[PDB]
A = this chain, B = another copy of it.
Amino acid sequence: MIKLCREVWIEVNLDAVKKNLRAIRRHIPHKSKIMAVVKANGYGHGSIEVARHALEHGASELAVASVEEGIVLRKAGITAPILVLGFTSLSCVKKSAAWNITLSAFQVDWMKEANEILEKEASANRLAIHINVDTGMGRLGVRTKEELLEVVKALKASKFLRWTGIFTHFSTADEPDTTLTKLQHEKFISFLSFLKKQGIELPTVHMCNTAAAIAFPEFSADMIRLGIGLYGLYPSAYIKQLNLVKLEPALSLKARIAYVKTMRTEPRTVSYGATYIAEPNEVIATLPIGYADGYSRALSNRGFVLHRGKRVPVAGRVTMDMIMVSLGENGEGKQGDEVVIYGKQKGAEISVDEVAEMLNTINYEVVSTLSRRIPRFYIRDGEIFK
């Protein structure tokens, strides 16, 4: 059994990750590759071991949010293509080329300036580039086919740069009204047709996130970007209710009870603000998770955890490192008992989706804000490591 000083931990089930990759692979066209999106520490699951597992079981490439995230993966021994999805300052072009990290860009000046930097440095490696086309997300990317053509030309004239992809991002592919997604797809294809009409040969074309991969597998083109689905989580209730691909949640969050007491003497106030008053025979268990771990303070007097297969409520306010839960009057519980904060236990389950609904957010935020001070353990072929 697990030995920790502070007994809170994450379990990432890599067998589920493999099953999730397999389900997406079996759904999308055979020719389409899979780019596993492991930005933000693998959506809080741990980027290194999720990326390693994905590449063993179906993925060809990786996506991250920054050069620094890509370098962490290279230092783990990973040789697969790694795309930075956001903006990379020209200050890191030299470093990105040396680590064989692929950068997104979409402006003539950036292309020309990056080339000149690598020229001046006598760079040993060329820098791989994907062009972002903004078709309605409004975040990053080139927005007109005229300007796109100039960006392509600047990239092609840059001998120290290497064009390896072109992509766009859907902003509402997880919604019931598909109008905007079809307009974006139509616009993207129009831009790509414009380039081909100029005789330009296209590199790897990718546009689908998890939502469009499930709902519009025919848009998979050369490659899709599998993010939330890799982790066994759906991009929206609507996509889940399509019932087209079966995903298995990979992440659980657990702890062991640090202390158990009956509230026999007064005062029976519990936690900050004294917002909860226990009964004289009520049993209160203290757990080593709090809002600095990413367990939202808005779950104060609201959240649930699983103990011995049953939902027991948070009592009083969440504190920075600890919560208290009620085991009820003369409730049964002991120090050391395992508690499930997100996940399954015996018959019961408190899913990340249910926590997100309670907090009026999305599963993406619940998992990707799990603090790095929580250790992560990995299950593969039914057994733990790391």
Contact = CB atoms under 8 A, between A and B. Distances in A.
A319 interface: yes
Interface string A115-135: 000000000000000000001
A86 to B, nearest CB: 6
A298 B138 CA distance: 19
A136 B316 CA distance: 12
Given A87-B258, A171-B273, A368-B291, A268 B320 contact: no
A263 B43 CA distance: 31
Count identical subunits in the complex: 2
A241 interface: no
Interface stretch (A3-11, A213-221, A245-253, A378-386): A3-11
Contacts of A368: 291-292, 320
Interface stretch (A89-97, A151-159, A199-207, A338-346): A89-97
Contact of A86 (B6, B183, B267): B6
A288 B272 CA distance: 35
A265 interface: yes
Interface string A40-66: 110110000000000000000000011
A25 interface: no
B373 A41 contact: yes
Contacts of A137: 269-272
Interface residues of A, number: 79
Given A39-B292, A138-B268, A138-B324, 16 more contacts: A3-B91, A6-B66, A6-B87, A41-B373, A136-B274, A138-B267, A138-B270, A139-B319, A140-B286, A143-B264, A171-B271, A172-B272, A291-B369, A292-B365, A297-B361, A371-B372
A91 B5 contact: yes
B273 A175 contact: yes
